Each structure stands twice: as C-alpha cells, then as structure tokens.
Short mmCIF file of C-alpha atoms and ligand atoms in Angstrom, two decimals:
data_model
loop_
_atom_site.label_atom_id
_atom_site.label_comp_id
_atom_site.label_asym_id
_atom_site.label_seq_id
_atom_site.Cartn_x
_atom_site.Cartn_y
_atom_site.Cartn_z
CA UNK A 51 139.07 50.31 106.39
CA UNK A 52 137.74 48.04 103.60
CA UNK A 53 138.48 44.32 103.93
CA UNK A 54 139.95 42.27 101.10
CA UNK A 55 141.43 38.78 101.21
CA UNK A 56 144.34 37.94 98.91
CA UNK A 57 143.60 35.10 96.51
CA UNK A 58 145.64 31.86 96.89
CA UNK A 59 147.09 31.96 93.39
CA UNK A 60 148.12 35.62 93.70
CA UNK A 61 149.83 34.90 97.03
CA UNK A 62 151.71 31.84 95.76
CA UNK A 63 152.68 33.46 92.45
CA UNK A 64 154.08 36.51 94.26
CA UNK A 65 155.67 35.01 97.38
CA UNK A 66 157.33 32.03 95.70
CA UNK A 67 161.03 32.31 96.53
CA UNK A 68 161.79 30.62 93.21
CA UNK A 69 159.54 32.76 91.03
CA UNK A 70 160.59 36.36 90.40
CA UNK A 71 157.73 38.71 89.52
CA UNK A 72 157.62 42.38 88.50
CA UNK A 73 155.33 43.04 91.46
CA UNK A 74 156.09 43.69 95.12
CA UNK A 75 153.57 42.66 97.76
CA UNK A 76 153.78 43.89 101.34
CA UNK A 77 151.77 42.16 104.05
CA UNK A 78 151.99 44.28 107.20
CA UNK A 79 151.02 43.84 110.84
CA UNK A 80 151.10 46.52 113.53
CA UNK A 81 151.38 45.74 117.25
CA UNK A 82 152.16 47.79 120.36
CA UNK A 83 155.01 46.85 122.69
CA UNK A 84 154.22 46.91 126.42
CA UNK A 85 155.57 45.43 129.66
CA UNK A 86 153.91 41.47 126.30
CA UNK A 87 152.69 42.96 123.03
CA UNK A 88 149.28 44.27 122.03
CA UNK A 89 148.39 42.82 118.64
CA UNK A 90 146.44 45.33 116.56
CA UNK A 91 144.60 42.90 114.28
CA UNK A 92 142.53 45.99 113.52
CA UNK A 93 145.50 47.17 111.46
CA UNK A 94 146.29 44.10 109.37
CA UNK A 95 146.53 44.53 105.61
CA UNK A 96 148.68 44.31 102.50
CA UNK A 97 149.98 46.48 99.67
CA UNK A 98 151.43 46.20 96.21
CA UNK A 99 153.31 48.71 94.09
CA UNK A 100 151.23 51.10 92.01
CA UNK A 101 150.90 50.36 88.30
CA UNK A 102 152.76 52.86 86.14
CA UNK A 103 151.05 54.86 83.39
CA UNK A 104 153.63 55.67 80.70
CA UNK A 105 150.92 57.47 78.71
CA UNK A 106 153.32 59.62 82.50
CA UNK A 107 153.96 58.36 86.03
CA UNK A 108 156.39 55.60 86.99
CA UNK A 109 154.28 54.09 89.77
CA UNK A 110 154.87 53.97 93.51
CA UNK A 111 156.78 51.18 95.27
CA UNK A 112 155.13 49.14 98.03
CA UNK A 113 157.53 50.40 100.71
CA UNK A 114 156.63 54.02 100.01
CA UNK A 115 152.98 52.97 99.81
CA UNK A 116 153.22 51.86 103.45
CA UNK A 117 154.71 55.21 104.45
CA UNK A 118 151.62 56.85 102.97
CA UNK A 119 149.64 54.52 105.23
CA UNK A 120 151.20 55.36 108.62
CA UNK A 121 149.05 58.41 109.49
CA UNK A 122 145.90 56.31 108.95
CA UNK A 123 147.15 53.96 111.67
CA UNK A 124 147.09 56.88 114.14
CA UNK A 125 149.96 55.55 116.24
CA UNK A 126 150.56 57.01 119.70
CA UNK A 127 153.85 58.96 119.65
CA UNK A 128 154.24 58.20 123.36
CA UNK A 129 153.91 54.43 122.91
CA UNK A 130 156.36 52.28 120.95
CA UNK A 131 155.21 50.05 118.10
CA UNK A 132 156.74 47.15 116.18
CA UNK A 133 155.79 47.07 112.51
CA UNK A 134 156.15 43.68 110.82
CA UNK A 135 156.59 43.40 107.06
CA UNK A 136 156.23 40.32 104.88
CA UNK A 137 157.44 41.96 101.68
CA UNK A 138 157.72 40.13 98.35
CA UNK A 139 160.95 41.80 97.24
CA UNK A 140 163.61 43.29 99.49
CA UNK A 141 163.34 47.11 99.26
CA UNK A 142 165.58 48.73 96.63
CA UNK A 143 168.11 51.55 96.91
CA UNK A 144 168.41 53.03 93.41
CA UNK A 145 164.85 54.22 93.89
CA UNK A 146 164.02 56.13 97.07
CA UNK A 147 162.78 53.08 98.99
CA UNK A 148 165.55 52.32 101.48
CA UNK A 149 166.16 56.06 101.74
CA UNK A 150 162.61 57.01 102.73
CA UNK A 151 162.36 54.09 105.15
CA UNK A 152 165.64 55.16 106.77
CA UNK A 153 164.31 58.70 107.19
CA UNK A 154 161.02 57.38 108.57
CA UNK A 155 162.61 55.19 111.26
CA UNK A 156 164.95 58.07 112.07
CA UNK A 157 162.10 60.57 112.51
CA UNK A 158 159.41 58.31 113.98
CA UNK A 159 161.57 56.79 116.72
CA UNK A 160 158.53 55.17 118.33
CA UNK A 161 158.51 52.53 115.59
CA UNK A 162 160.53 49.33 115.26
CA UNK A 163 160.46 47.80 111.79
CA UNK A 164 160.71 44.04 111.25
CA UNK A 165 161.08 43.08 107.60
CA UNK A 166 160.64 39.57 106.21
CA UNK A 167 161.68 39.26 102.57
CA UNK A 168 160.55 36.33 100.41
CA UNK A 169 163.46 36.92 98.03
CA UNK A 170 166.29 39.39 97.38
CA UNK A 171 165.90 42.12 94.75
CA UNK A 172 169.39 41.69 93.28
CA UNK A 173 168.28 43.24 89.99
CA UNK A 174 169.13 46.55 91.62
CA UNK A 175 172.93 47.13 91.41
CA UNK A 176 172.85 48.64 94.90
CA UNK A 177 170.66 45.96 96.51
CA UNK A 178 173.43 45.27 99.03
CA UNK A 179 173.55 48.90 100.14
CA UNK A 180 169.76 48.89 100.48
CA UNK A 181 169.65 46.05 103.01
CA UNK A 182 172.63 47.55 104.84
CA UNK A 183 171.08 51.01 105.26
CA UNK A 184 167.90 49.37 106.55
CA UNK A 185 170.04 47.51 109.08
CA UNK A 186 171.70 50.76 110.17
CA UNK A 187 168.24 52.29 110.51
CA UNK A 188 167.49 49.75 113.23
CA UNK A 189 165.29 47.33 111.32
CA UNK A 190 165.28 43.54 111.63
CA UNK A 191 165.89 42.28 108.10
CA UNK A 192 165.53 38.53 107.53
CA UNK A 193 164.31 36.00 104.94
CA UNK A 194 160.86 34.40 104.96
CA UNK A 195 160.79 30.74 105.98
CA UNK A 196 157.98 28.15 106.07
CA UNK A 197 156.69 29.71 109.30
CA UNK A 198 156.31 33.17 107.78
CA UNK A 199 154.81 31.75 104.58
CA UNK A 200 152.26 29.64 106.46
CA UNK A 201 151.40 32.66 108.59
CA UNK A 202 150.60 34.95 105.66
CA UNK A 203 148.57 32.13 104.11
CA UNK A 204 146.49 31.75 107.26
CA UNK A 205 146.28 35.49 107.90
CA UNK A 206 146.02 37.20 104.50
CA UNK A 207 144.74 34.55 102.07
CA UNK A 208 141.16 33.46 101.39
CA UNK A 209 142.13 29.83 101.93
CA UNK A 210 138.72 28.55 103.08
CA UNK A 211 140.04 25.73 105.27
CA UNK A 212 142.77 24.67 102.84
CA UNK A 213 146.09 24.40 104.72
CA UNK A 214 149.29 25.99 103.43
CA UNK A 215 150.85 23.76 100.77
CA UNK A 216 154.64 24.24 100.43
CA UNK A 217 156.00 24.60 96.90
CA UNK A 218 159.00 22.52 95.85
CA UNK A 219 162.31 23.73 97.26
CA UNK A 220 160.77 26.19 99.72
CA UNK A 221 163.26 25.43 102.51
CA UNK A 222 166.25 25.24 100.18
CA UNK A 223 165.54 28.69 98.75
CA UNK A 224 165.08 30.08 102.26
CA UNK A 225 168.39 28.69 103.51
CA UNK A 226 170.17 29.83 100.35
CA UNK A 227 168.74 33.35 100.54
CA UNK A 228 169.46 33.49 104.27
CA UNK A 229 173.15 32.94 103.54
CA UNK A 230 173.25 35.70 100.94
CA UNK A 231 171.65 38.17 103.36
CA UNK A 232 174.08 36.91 105.98
CA UNK A 233 176.91 37.84 103.62
CA UNK A 234 175.43 41.24 102.72
CA UNK A 235 174.87 42.13 106.38
CA UNK A 236 178.35 40.92 107.35
CA UNK A 237 180.22 44.16 107.99
CA UNK B 300 140.05 40.71 107.89
CA UNK B 301 143.00 42.46 106.20
CA UNK B 302 142.58 46.07 105.10
CA UNK B 303 143.30 46.76 101.44
CA UNK B 304 142.50 49.84 99.38
CA UNK B 305 141.73 49.46 95.69
CA UNK B 306 144.04 51.30 93.29
CA UNK B 307 142.70 54.23 91.21
CA UNK B 308 143.41 52.65 87.81
CA UNK B 309 142.01 49.28 88.90
CA UNK B 310 138.78 51.04 89.86
CA UNK B 311 138.41 53.48 86.97
CA UNK B 312 139.12 50.82 84.34
CA UNK B 313 136.87 48.16 85.88
CA UNK B 314 133.86 50.29 86.83
CA UNK B 315 133.86 52.24 83.57
CA UNK B 316 130.31 52.01 82.19
CA UNK B 317 131.34 52.18 78.54
CA UNK B 318 134.32 49.84 78.32
CA UNK B 319 134.14 46.16 79.22
CA UNK B 320 136.63 44.26 81.37
CA UNK B 321 137.06 40.50 81.67
CA UNK B 322 136.58 40.29 85.44
CA UNK B 323 133.96 41.42 87.95
CA UNK B 324 134.61 43.67 90.94
CA UNK B 325 132.18 43.86 93.86
CA UNK B 326 132.26 46.64 96.45
CA UNK B 327 129.93 45.79 99.32
CA UNK B 328 128.62 47.70 102.33
CA UNK B 329 126.56 46.52 105.30
CA UNK B 330 124.30 48.64 107.51
CA UNK B 331 121.94 47.82 110.36
CA UNK B 332 118.42 49.23 110.12
CA UNK B 333 117.73 50.38 113.68
CA UNK B 334 120.04 53.18 109.74
CA UNK B 335 123.61 52.84 111.02
CA UNK B 336 126.61 52.51 108.70
CA UNK B 337 128.40 49.38 109.89
CA UNK B 338 131.85 50.45 108.73
CA UNK B 339 134.59 47.78 108.87
CA UNK B 340 131.87 45.48 107.53
CA UNK B 341 132.72 46.91 104.12
CA UNK B 342 135.25 45.78 101.54
CA UNK B 343 135.50 44.64 97.94
CA UNK B 344 135.71 41.42 95.96
CA UNK B 345 136.73 40.19 92.53
CA UNK B 346 136.03 36.87 90.83
CA UNK B 347 138.50 34.10 91.65
CA UNK B 348 140.56 33.44 88.52
CA UNK B 349 139.94 30.17 86.80
CA UNK B 350 142.67 27.69 86.55
CA UNK B 351 141.64 25.21 83.95
CA UNK B 352 144.49 22.67 84.17
CA UNK B 353 143.78 21.94 87.73
CA UNK B 354 140.12 21.67 86.92
CA UNK B 355 139.09 24.82 88.69
CA UNK B 356 136.61 27.05 86.98
CA UNK B 357 136.92 29.97 89.28
CA UNK B 358 134.27 31.56 91.47
CA UNK B 359 132.13 34.57 90.57
CA UNK B 360 132.18 37.78 92.62
CA UNK B 361 128.55 37.44 93.69
CA UNK B 362 129.00 33.91 95.04
CA UNK B 363 132.21 34.92 96.81
CA UNK B 364 130.14 37.37 98.83
CA UNK B 365 127.78 34.58 99.85
CA UNK B 366 130.81 32.72 101.22
CA UNK B 367 131.66 35.87 103.16
CA UNK B 368 128.25 36.16 104.86
CA UNK B 369 128.97 33.91 107.86
CA UNK B 370 132.10 36.03 108.41
CA UNK B 371 129.85 39.07 108.87
CA UNK B 372 128.22 37.59 111.99
CA UNK B 373 124.83 39.15 111.26
CA UNK B 374 122.08 39.05 113.88
CA UNK B 375 118.84 37.28 112.92
CA UNK B 376 117.23 39.45 115.60
CA UNK B 377 118.18 42.56 113.61
CA UNK B 378 117.58 43.88 110.10
CA UNK B 379 120.33 44.70 107.60
CA UNK B 380 120.61 46.17 104.12
CA UNK B 381 123.56 45.03 102.03
CA UNK B 382 124.63 47.33 99.21
CA UNK B 383 126.45 45.97 96.17
CA UNK B 384 128.58 48.10 93.89
CA UNK B 385 129.24 45.51 91.21
CA UNK B 386 131.13 45.91 87.93
CA UNK B 387 129.03 43.51 85.86
CA UNK B 388 125.38 42.73 86.59
CA UNK B 389 125.08 39.22 88.13
CA UNK B 390 124.56 36.45 85.56
CA UNK B 391 122.04 33.62 85.34
CA UNK B 392 123.40 30.92 83.03
CA UNK B 393 126.24 30.21 85.49
CA UNK B 394 124.29 30.29 88.74
CA UNK B 395 124.69 33.75 90.28
CA UNK B 396 121.11 35.04 90.05
CA UNK B 397 119.52 31.82 91.27
CA UNK B 398 121.86 31.37 94.22
CA UNK B 399 121.73 35.04 95.24
CA UNK B 400 117.93 34.95 95.09
CA UNK B 401 117.95 31.73 97.11
CA UNK B 402 120.11 33.38 99.78
CA UNK B 403 117.53 36.15 100.24
CA UNK B 404 114.82 33.57 100.90
CA UNK B 405 116.84 31.69 103.51
CA UNK B 406 117.78 35.04 105.04
CA UNK B 407 114.76 37.36 105.18
CA UNK B 408 116.54 39.51 107.77
CA UNK B 409 118.69 41.04 105.02
CA UNK B 410 117.65 43.19 102.08
CA UNK B 411 119.88 43.55 99.03
CA UNK B 412 120.69 46.61 96.91
CA UNK B 413 122.65 46.13 93.69
CA UNK B 414 124.29 48.97 91.78
CA UNK B 415 125.55 47.54 88.49
CA UNK B 416 128.13 49.67 86.69
CA UNK B 417 127.50 47.71 83.51
CA UNK B 418 124.95 45.31 82.03
CA UNK B 419 126.44 41.85 81.45
CA UNK B 420 124.66 41.09 78.17
CA UNK B 421 127.26 38.43 77.33
CA UNK B 422 124.88 36.04 79.06
CA UNK B 423 122.04 35.25 76.62
CA UNK B 424 119.71 35.22 79.64
CA UNK B 425 121.03 38.44 81.18
CA UNK B 426 117.54 39.91 81.36
CA UNK B 427 116.22 36.88 83.26
CA UNK B 428 118.99 37.36 85.83
CA UNK B 429 118.04 40.97 86.56
CA UNK B 430 114.35 40.06 86.78
CA UNK B 431 114.98 37.18 89.19
CA UNK B 432 116.96 39.47 91.49
CA UNK B 433 114.09 41.95 91.67
CA UNK B 434 111.52 39.22 92.34
CA UNK B 435 113.69 38.13 95.27
CA UNK B 436 113.24 41.51 96.96
CA UNK B 437 116.44 43.25 95.88
CA UNK B 438 116.93 46.74 94.46
CA UNK B 439 118.46 46.35 91.00
CA UNK B 440 119.89 49.67 89.85
CA UNK B 441 122.57 51.23 87.66
CA UNK B 442 125.58 53.07 89.09
CA UNK B 443 125.23 56.84 88.72
CA UNK B 444 127.88 59.52 89.43
CA UNK B 445 126.87 59.45 93.10
CA UNK B 446 127.74 55.76 93.38
CA UNK B 447 130.98 56.07 91.41
CA UNK B 448 132.06 59.01 93.57
CA UNK B 449 131.13 57.08 96.71
CA UNK B 450 133.16 54.03 95.66
CA UNK B 451 136.09 56.29 94.81
CA UNK B 452 135.87 57.92 98.22
CA UNK B 453 135.26 54.73 100.18
CA UNK B 454 137.14 51.83 98.58
CA UNK B 455 139.76 53.50 96.37
CA UNK B 456 143.20 54.64 97.55
CA UNK B 457 142.56 58.14 96.21
CA UNK B 458 145.28 59.71 98.38
CA UNK B 459 143.22 62.88 98.79
CA UNK B 460 142.61 63.26 95.06
CA UNK B 461 138.95 63.93 94.19
CA UNK B 462 136.89 61.73 91.87
CA UNK B 463 137.28 62.55 88.19
CA UNK B 464 134.44 61.05 86.12
CA UNK B 465 135.56 59.47 82.86
CA UNK B 466 134.25 60.67 79.49
CA UNK B 467 130.60 59.74 79.01
CA UNK B 468 129.97 58.54 82.57
CA UNK B 469 126.62 60.31 82.87
CA UNK B 470 125.80 59.56 79.23
CA UNK B 471 126.29 55.80 79.54
CA UNK B 472 124.53 55.76 82.91
CA UNK B 473 121.31 57.13 81.41
CA UNK B 474 121.42 54.75 78.44
CA UNK B 475 122.01 51.80 80.76
CA UNK B 476 119.34 53.07 83.16
CA UNK B 477 116.90 53.20 80.26
CA UNK B 478 117.80 49.64 79.33
CA UNK B 479 117.37 48.33 82.88
CA UNK B 480 113.93 49.79 83.61
CA UNK B 481 112.79 48.59 80.19
CA UNK B 482 113.88 45.10 81.24
CA UNK B 483 112.24 45.34 84.67
CA UNK B 484 109.17 46.81 83.00
CA UNK B 485 108.56 43.30 81.69
CL1 LIG C 776 144.00 42.93 94.21
CL1 LIG C 777 145.25 40.34 85.43
ZN1 LIG C 778 142.48 40.98 95.05
ZN1 LIG C 779 160.89 47.30 95.04
ZN1 LIG C 780 161.83 50.19 95.71
ZN1 LIG C 781 144.83 46.00 94.80
ZN1 LIG C 782 143.45 40.70 83.28
ZN1 LIG C 783 129.39 37.79 86.42
ZN1 LIG C 784 127.90 35.18 87.58
#
C-alpha cells in the first residue's frame, strides 16, 4: 500500500461542517475486536469519490470505493472487525450507496461499521431514508465533533507539528447537525 | 502513514509526456541494497498548493520528499536507492535542484534515481537543474512505457484494468530522451 498524507487545506476545505463541497472524502480505520481492540494502523487510509468523465461514466461514490477496498484488507471471516468511517458527506440513498452498504453489512456479518459524518447530504431527497437504512443495517451513525476532527488532522493530515485549528462555529454546527440526525433516527 | 491509491485520470493526465499540467506529482520507491523492494516505504506526493493571501508560497514535490526522509527511518549502516517517478523535472530557480543535491551529500548512504515524465523548461535554467542532479550522483532519466506501466500498476487504483498508453507516449518519450542526453552531454 502506497502512503499519501492529505494536505491541510484539502482536509479543512472538505471537512468543514459549514462548507458544502461537491466531493466526498472518507477517512477509514480498521481494527479487530477481541476480549480490548487490536488497532490495525497498517490499514489506515482515505478515499474520495471518482471524478466523472461525461465525454461517459458518472464516477464512483466514496462509500462504494471502500467496498472495492475490503478484499485488499484481507479480513479474517472468523474474527470480528469494527470499521470506522470519517466521511465528508453522509452516504446517499438515491444512488446505490446506502443500499450497497446495507448489503455488505448483511453479508459480511463479521464487520461492525461506525460512521462519522462531517455534515448531512440533504441535497438528496431521500437522505433521511439513507441514514435510517444504515441504522437498520447495524451501523453507528453520528456527527463529527471537535474530537473526530482533531483526530483526522493528527492521523491523516501532513500537519508537520501544527496543531488542529478549529474553524469558526465548529461546535455549533456539530450540535445543530447532531439534532437533525437525532430527528432523522427518531423512529 | 495512511494508504491512498491515485486515481486513473489523475495519473494519466498528470504523467502525460505531451500535455503540461500546473502541478507536480512524485511517485517514490525505496529499496535496500543488500536489492530488496522495501514495499510500504512507497507512496506518492504532489506540490503543496500555494495560498498567497496568507503569505504561503507552497512547497514543491521534491522538497516535500526531503521532509519525508526522517519518516523513512533509513539505516546509515545500510545502503538504499530511492526511485523518483516525477511529473515535472525538478527545477533550479526555486531551490529544488540545489537542495536535492545537497541532501545527497549529507546522506551518502542513499543513491537517487529520477524518472521525469516531462522536462520542466518553464524554468529558464532547467538545463542547469538536470546537470546539477547528475553531478550529485543521481540517475536523471525520462519515463518510458516501462515506468508508466509500473506507476499504473503500483500507485494507481487501476481496479484490475491494464495500463493503456496514451497517444504518442513512446513518441514523446524518445524526443524527450533525446533532449535530456543532449543536455547531459554538456
Ligand atoms: Cl489527492
Ligand atoms: Cl485542482
Ligand atoms: Zn493529495
Ligand atoms: Zn455521496
Ligand atoms: Zn452516494
Ligand atoms: Zn487521490
Ligand atoms: Zn488544478
Ligand atoms: Zn517543479
Ligand atoms: Zn521545484
């Protein structure tokens, strides 16, 4: 696996819970659950969606791009793993994102998915149904807070000593988005 | 470090040896000479985007590798060869050639091999950059099909799809190879 650190400006421009970009970024961490966990820092990495090419292929969403990644991880079917996502947008439904993830968790039962969204993709009419199907699939869906933002900065960004610097209204956007998710997940 | 595969279009458009792009990509590999391919010591880099406004003038791909050297944890008791698959040939008038050459002198336990996919003649002293790199004990070459195919196989998220050389890949390679050896001739 080739190493590549995410640049500070690309991280901040994409994971700002006030800025909405036409790109989805997906920082992922794999770890094995035992009696304690076993952190597989070997398997850290991130993804974005694939750029479309109208002149003809509409690109591939980051969620699906992680599902293409799973065999490379060579997970033990006997053992159980917890996959952690720090995804830029909450996975959609109108496109086969929430659907394929549901099928994956259903088939590969040895995987627990923990998703941290920076912001909610409400530009998809069925964004509510997306988060709900993920919840039914057994995933932990929640909103990124300062802790999760500082983590990805320390873990995935070429910071070079520079500490994580919170943008204006980071906490307010978190709390606001937490309430919306709390309403969507309220059955 | 975090694993991240380069996208097909990002690779094919940047490492094209006929068309120019505004940023530099640098695929690097490390191997101990005792040769053993030190996989997981490989990855790729791009120049850090400038942000004039907050007076930041970016950082070139070559220099970003130099920052990454202590991360490698190389052994002074061993001997390594670092291979560079770089989009533009390292410049001079902005400090890449001089600082890369200087690194080789401080670190004689490492030998450098540079495969440029394109000659950065935007620098008026682009020839002096290439010559300085050679005089520092580094192989200065031009990316051929072999290197492009290797980068596609190694760094690019090809998803099983084989490497498809763009139009004029071999043609431009020869022309650029003729230019380079004519430069290093002098
Ligand atoms: Cl990138
Ligand atoms: Cl860009
Ligand atoms: Zn990058
Ligand atoms: Zn999406
Ligand atoms: Zn989607
Ligand atoms: Zn990329
Ligand atoms: Zn650009
Ligand atoms: Zn350059
Ligand atoms: Zn330069």
